[PDB]
Design a protein around this ligand. Structure first.
Ligand code: R7O
Length: 346
């Protein structure tokens, strides 16, 4: 009925465990599914190693976006082995039965699965520091002028562990990514990790990934998302609870500024007033990250009192770096090279 019987009604390849492709790949199991298509675990019989295969939907719009993804991955390969790693390596791409397939190295589970393994108690600040250092190094690689790649969907699920017993991680899935001079989407990033400039409908650059990283790092240590908005208005309001009203010079140039805020006659911006006798959000900037992290009270849940790398000085350094990553202004938000110089690391 669809693609000579190889596709379902949603342009997806019907995965059958054990099938052999091109006398090379033995499909093992379904790993996951997304809007792009599916991801399967497979054994490369020629190279004798496990691989992950992204099976793109047999539909032109998804094929074309994956062709951009392949070009970006290949651009990173011309620099690869010669620059910051911490990025999932594209091993091969090919067409198979009207599906574009992307072969990657097979890694372990993602950082959200790690959080779930701890029952969302969070991981230590020492492990968070290691994750932060590797991700800042990976963002520095993307910031290479010839690359200038914006990932556009950084989240715990898109950061994979190399080995479930080690701290090595890699960024995965550049299916929504773009170069700085080639921006085509505006509804980008997962909502919890969406930058203010994207929420405000402003032009964005590579700084949006650094905003996502700040949200990710706090969640990794606390076990819970920092800004868990159910919609765009709720997301902006949860950001304002912690960070306050964005600067006026930003809101004055934001096309969607009045979707969340109001400009009083004095030129000062305020939040749009909620309705009737409904409970208000915390006043702007009163949900202090200082207390979300438990800087003076033994960390999240008080579980870190006396733990090495969890001194008050350590939490003050971590809080400072996060606030630099959560700068409202994308032109002054901390950049990957200078995040790596932060005293949180050395
Ligand atoms: O080695 C891999 C691996 O172990 C995994 C993987 C592990 C653990 C999971 O719980 C999982 O759902 C996927 O996915 C991979 C991929 O899929 C990504 O998965 C993410 C979830 O983490 C989604 O967010 C992305 O959309 C999706 O592309 C790849 O594109 C490439 C890979 O090399 C792997």
């Amino acid at each position: 009925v669809y693609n000579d019987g190889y596709d379902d009604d949603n342009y997806d390849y019907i995965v059958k465990n054990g099938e052999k492709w091109m006398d090379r790949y033995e499909i093992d199991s379904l790993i996951g599914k997304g809007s792009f298509g599916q991801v399967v675990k497979a054994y490369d019989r020629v190279e004798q190693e496990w691989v992950a295969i992204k099976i793109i939907k047999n539909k032109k719009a998804f094929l074309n976006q994956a062709q951009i993804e392949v070009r970006l991955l290949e651009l990173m390969n011309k620099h690869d082995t010669e620059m910051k790693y911490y990025i999932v390596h594209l091993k091969r791409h090919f067409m198979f039965r009207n599906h574009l397939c992307l072969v990657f190295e097979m890694l372990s589970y993602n950082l959200y699965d790690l959080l779930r393994n701890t029952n969302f108690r969070g991981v230590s600040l020492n492990l968070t520091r290691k994750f932060a250092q590797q991700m800042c190094t990976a963002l520095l690689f993307l910031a290479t002028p010839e690359l200038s790649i914006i990932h556009c969907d950084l989240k715990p699920e898109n950061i994979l562990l190399c080995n479930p017993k080690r701290s090595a991680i890699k960024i995965v899935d550049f299916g929504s990514s773009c170069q700085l001079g080639q921006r085509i989407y505006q509804y980008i990033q997962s909502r919890f990790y969406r930058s203010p400039e994207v929420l405000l409908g402003m032009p964005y650059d590579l700084a949006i990934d650094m905003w996502s990283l700040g949200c990710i790092l706090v969640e990794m240590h606390t076990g819970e998302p920092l800004f868990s908005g159910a919609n765009e208005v709720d997301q902006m309001n949860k950001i304002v609870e912690v960070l306050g009203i964005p600067p006026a010079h930003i809101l004055d140039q934001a096309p969607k500024a009045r979707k969340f805020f109001e400009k009083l006659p004095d030129g000062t911006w305020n939040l749009k007033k909620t309705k009737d006798g409904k409970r208000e959000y915390k006043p702007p900037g009163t949900r202090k990250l200082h207390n979300i992290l438990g800087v003076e009270t033994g960390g999240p849940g008080g579980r870190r009192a006396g733990e090495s790398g969890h001194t008050v000085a350590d939490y003050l350094k971590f809080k400072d770096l996060i606030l630099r990553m959560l700068d409202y202004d994308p032109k002054t938000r901390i950049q990957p090279y200078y995040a790596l110089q932060h005293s949180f690391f050395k």
